């Protein structure tokens, strides 16, 4: 079960200055990058083209190249149109892609945030505002919905292109998508109060179990931290336990992860 996400960020500082940057994710693996400085979309994996032929990819890239330039002017014009209801600086975020289900099932999405708030989506055959969006956006919506060429292209992208492309990617990227990388753990402490820290690093995929232990007894005081990325597309997590000073003895950190093949990591303090 995989979510493919095209994430676009644009900053418009004033009427003349802007940049648009994109990253593409399949699950938590980066597949593409498109910097404002670059004329072309960059592959960040060898399999980033999926099952598309060179001609299909060139065509799809060309459509995106036209899109980026067109998007930029459109925002600038919509700002002029709504003036002086909205002013620079302006942030626009797009999140577009498809979630892939078993069989031949998928759901596509295209969500738009404005100053960090989700306000607009494409749905069915047209752009629409979502609950909580300001009323002034009805004019941009009407203007966007006037463009039948764009609506036809977006419908095809979302209904057909996205799931077909992602199916190709899942086939082409299988060995990276299914990689297993071992976690390595180590221990330390911080401030008669003592906070023990179990550090767990280098694991892939994300699902992992980390607990403080006294023998067979699970210490139900363990606070699991956030998942933090490493630079090499592996994960980092730490689990903390609060104890009295002197109470350190006999305590262990147990780690469970799919790469270990049942052979858990146990580190005694």
């Amino acid at each position, epitope marked *: 079960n995989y979510t493919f996400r095209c994430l676009q960020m644009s900053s418009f500082a004033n009427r003349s200055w802007s940049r648009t940057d994109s990253v593409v994710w399949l699950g938590d693996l980066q597949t593409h990058r498109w910097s404002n400085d670059s004329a072309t979309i960059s592959f960040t994996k060898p399999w980033s083209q999926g099952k598309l032929s060179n001609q299909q990819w060139e065509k799809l890239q060309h459509m995106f190249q*036209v899109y980026r*330039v*067109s998007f930029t*002017r*459109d925002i600038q*014009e*919509l700002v*002029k*149109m709504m*003036s002086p209801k909205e002013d620079y600086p302006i942030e626009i975020q797009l999140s577009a892609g498809c979630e892939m289900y078993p069989g031949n099932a998928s759901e596509s999405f295209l969500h738009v945030a404005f100053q960090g708030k989700y306000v607009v989506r494409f749905w069915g055959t047209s752009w629409q505002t979502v609950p909580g969006a300001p009323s002034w956006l009805d004019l941009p919506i*009407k*203007v*966007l*919905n*006037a*463009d*039948q*060429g*764009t609506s036809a292209t977006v419908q095809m992208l979302l209904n057909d292109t996205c799931p077909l492309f992602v199916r190709g990617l899942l086939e082409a990227g299988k060995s990276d998508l299914e990689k297993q990388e071992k976690p390595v753990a180590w221990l330390s402490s911080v401030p008669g109060h003592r906070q023990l820290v179990c550090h767990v690093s280098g694991f892939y995929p994300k699902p992992v179990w980390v607990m403080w232990m006294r023998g067979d007894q699970e210490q139900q005081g363990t606070h699991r931290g956030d998942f933090l990325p490493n630079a090499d597309e592996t994960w980092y997590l730490q689990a903390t336990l609060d104890v009295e000073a002197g109470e350190e003895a006999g305590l262990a950190c147990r780690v469970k992860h799919s790469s270990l093949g049942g052979q858990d990591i146990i580190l005694y303090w």
Partner: T-cell receptor
Amino acid sequence: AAVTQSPRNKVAVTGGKVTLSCNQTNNHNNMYWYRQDTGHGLRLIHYSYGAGSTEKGDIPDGYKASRPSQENFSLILELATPSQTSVYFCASGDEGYTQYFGPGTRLLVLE
Amino acid sequence: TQVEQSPQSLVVRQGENCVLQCNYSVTPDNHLRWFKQDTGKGLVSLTVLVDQKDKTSNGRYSATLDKDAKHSTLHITATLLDDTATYICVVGDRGSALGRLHFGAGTQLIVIP
């Protein structure tokens, strides 16, 4: 959808103030001013997305625009020059791509 | 310029057919309109082409558009004296009010009665 222009024809002097007016009863938000000179396609001077909005086109220099109401879009030449001798076209439209053009205004700025 | 018409001008005899060309570099290209402009007068729309490979007609006018080649032709069948006019090609870069229009400088047709 109908657009009208006044005056239809105008002789003016260098340094004079000339105002070209365009009226439209279609309830169109958007209005556009162009000039046509031989050897060139129509070129955009100023446009407007509604009352109070004026925007620079491709060749805005020497022209001011005014949109006092939904109906009226004016092109103001504060200090007329011989280079502003031309045929001027106003257009209007809604959210759609079609622009509805007025009949044109011929301007001659004499020295 | 981004929109070029050919020929610049031509003279034909009444009853003859003629073809006018428009080539452009406008990106993107949503639609293309042909205008007829009589001397002194304004702009009368003859046809608009919207599709990748398009064909339209309006009486004795017919037109083609090929978006891949960025090329359009206007064909006038059996010309009459009243066809004497400038014919103007216009490319719209959006399917909405957000578009800019890119005008060609026109083709002058003279029809000898």
